[PDB]
């Protein structure tokens, strides 16, 4: 997250860190949203590589003991069947991870609330991106979870020529684009939390930013629109 602020420890209890085994250690690679005690929602592109993955819930600082973490292996990966790794712009950037164990809920570990199917936010709706991604274009991961206020940019504006043009689809949510704050590498897969009817819900799964940089004016961060995939999500969890 570029231009973020440190999140309070118990603000976003559904945020997880998706990590891969690297030598004798574990490296953060993407975010995710806990949606069941044994299921996480993340981006399909995060699990393209044939790596060994684990999920950390109740995580605040990647590099220090928070005293609240639970570490759990990934038992099964279900990517959306229409996902194509060489075409992120086609959409379908979503995957569900079944955990080896069911995590315990508390003030640091909760399920993320998903929007009702078909919900589209009005232009400029209040949302926060959260994650441990790069704090600057070509920078380094954050140590502590960051948040940045990124208002939505509706489909009509987002798909206009000076924004993303044809690259953005109606199955995506755009947010931000002010040139100061944005998602960045390492934030992929995580949530876009939007306040609707007094409750935050996870409306987006972080998918991509411009190849020119993270915080680029008129290139808002692009997310998979969660409300387009409610039936798919329910179908996977029910058959697995
Ligand atoms: Cl949450
Ligand atoms: Na930690
Ligand atoms: Xe990203």
Task: Note whether 161 and 137 are same-domain residues.
Answer: yes
d(CA 42, CA 148): 19
DSSP character for 227? Answer: G
Taken in order 125, 128, 134, 139, the sign of the CA dihedral is positive
Annotated catalytic, 45?
yes
| 185 ligand 3 Cβ < 6 A | yes
Give the closest residue to 121 by CA, choosing from 187, 188, 193, 189.
193
Task: Note whether 145 and 220 are same-domain residues.
Answer: yes
Q: Provide the token pair at 191.
A: 């949530």
In Å, how far from its chain's centre is CA 151?
A: 16
Domain count, the chain: 2
- Give the CATH number of the domain where residue 82 resides: 2.40.10.10
Gap from CA of 210 to ligand 1 centroid (Å):
27
Experimental determination approach used: X-ray
d(CA 145, CA 59): 8
Contact status, residue 132 vs residue 61, Cβ threshold 8 Å: no
| 187 ligand 3 Cβ < 6 A | yes
Domain extent, residue 156, equals: 1-12+112-227
In Å, how far from its chain's centre is CA 224?
A: 9
3-state class of 47 per DSSP?
helix
**The tokens 């590498």 sit on which residue?**
185
Shortest-distance ligand to the CA of residue 108 = 1
| 29 ligand 3 Cβ < 6 A | no
Shortest-distance ligand to the CA of residue 13 = 1
Q: What are phi and psi of 237, to 5 degrees?
A: -65, -40
């Amino acid at each position: 997250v570029v231009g973020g602020t440190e999140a309070q420890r118990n603000s976003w209890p559904s945020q997880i860190s998706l990590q891969y085994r690297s030598g004798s250690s574990w490296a953060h690679t993407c975010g995710g949203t806990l949606i069941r005690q044994n299921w996480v929602m993340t981006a399909a592109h995060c699990v393209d590589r044939e790596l060994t993955f684990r999920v950390v819930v109740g995580e605040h600082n990647l590099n220090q003991n928070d005293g609240t973490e639970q570490y759990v292996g990934v038992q099964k990966i279900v990517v959306h069947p229409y996902w194509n790794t060489d075409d992120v712009a086609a959409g379908y950037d979503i995957a569900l991870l079944r955990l080896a164990q069911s995590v315990t809920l508390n003030s640091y570990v909760q399920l993320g609330v998903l929007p009702r199917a078909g919900t589209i936010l009005a232009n400029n709706s209040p949302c926060y991106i959260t994650g441990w991604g790069l704090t600057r274009t070509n920078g380094q991961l954050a140590q502590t979870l960051q948040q940045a206020y990124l208002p939505t940019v509706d489909y009509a504006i987002c798909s206009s020529s000076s924004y993303w043009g044809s690259t953005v689809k109606n199955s995506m949510v755009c947010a931000g684009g002010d040139g100061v704050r944005s998602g960045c590498q390492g934030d992929s897969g995580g949530p876009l939390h939007c306040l609707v009817n007094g409750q935050y819900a996870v409306h987006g799964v972080t998918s991509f930013v411009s190849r020119l940089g993270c915080n680029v004016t008129r290139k808002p961060t692009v997310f998979t629109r969660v409300s387009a995939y409610i039936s798919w999500i329910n179908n996977v969890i029910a058959s697995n």
